[PDB]
Design a protein around this ligand. Structure first.
Ligand SMILES: Nc1nc2c(ncn2[C@@H]2O[C@H](COP(=O)(O)OP(=O)(O)O)[C@@H](O)[C@H]2O)c(=O)[nH]1
Ligand SMILES: [Mg+2]
Length: 180
């Protein structure tokens, strides 16, 4: 049968985690807001002639969920660790919060660092809202640097809005999950 692997997605609230999982649904998603996918979603990825089924586990990044979140970690095969390119704060929390949490609960599990919302890097409204506080969108080189700092298997940028990069995120996650 297909190889069975578990993926968990983590990162600050609002950085696009749930949308990144939902893009792998064959069904049109209804016009509702869900903090976390609460049904059993699976990504069917073929890599190197191998059929893999990736169980996708969503999490809530907010501090109030810190005690419940580790219940999602048992037997994880790959982590998608997300920040948003429109949120320098979300990148700052990668080494400060997400990296030590997942290394504790998921020792030796490969991490794919994902910069979501790539479409906002050049977005005029985003640039203005960050610029007013003397900030700017995350640059690709900052994501690469952070992947090195945290020991990630890779760094990828994607936009669920435009779909650019989404395929590579799940293909890389699958290749990472297959290494163990
Ligand atoms: N511009 C843009 N917005 C996005 C993208 N992905 C998600 N969003 C928006 O970001 C908000 C948070 O997304 P969500 O998946 O709920 O984030 P989560 O809290 O990390 O699960 C939602 O309003 C989405 O519409 C993206 O790639 N580009
Ligand atoms: Mg969510």
């Amino acid at each position: 049968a297909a190889i069975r692997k578990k993926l968990v997605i983590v990162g600050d609230g609002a950085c696009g985690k749930t949308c990144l999982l939902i893009v792998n649904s064959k069904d049109q998603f209804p016009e509702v807001y869900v903090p976390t996918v609460f049904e059993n979603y699976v990504a069917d990825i073929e890599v190197d002639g191998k059929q893999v089924e990736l169980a996708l586990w969503d999490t809530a990044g907010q501090e109030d969920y810190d005690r419940l979140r580790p219940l999602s970690y048992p037997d994880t095969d790959v982590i998608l660790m997300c920040f948003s390119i429109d949120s320098p704060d979300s990148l700052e929390n990668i080494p400060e919060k997400w990296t030590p949490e997942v290394k504790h609960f998921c020792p030796n599990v490969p991490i794919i660092l994902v910069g979501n919302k790539k479409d906002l890097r050049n977005d005029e409204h985003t640039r203005r809202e960050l610029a007013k506080m003397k900030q700017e969108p995350v640059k690709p080189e900052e994501g690469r640097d952070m992947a090195n700092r945290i020991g990630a298997f890779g760094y990828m940028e994607c936009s669920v809005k435009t779909k650019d990069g989404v395929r590579e995120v799940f293909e890389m996650a699958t290749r990472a999950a297959l290494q163990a």
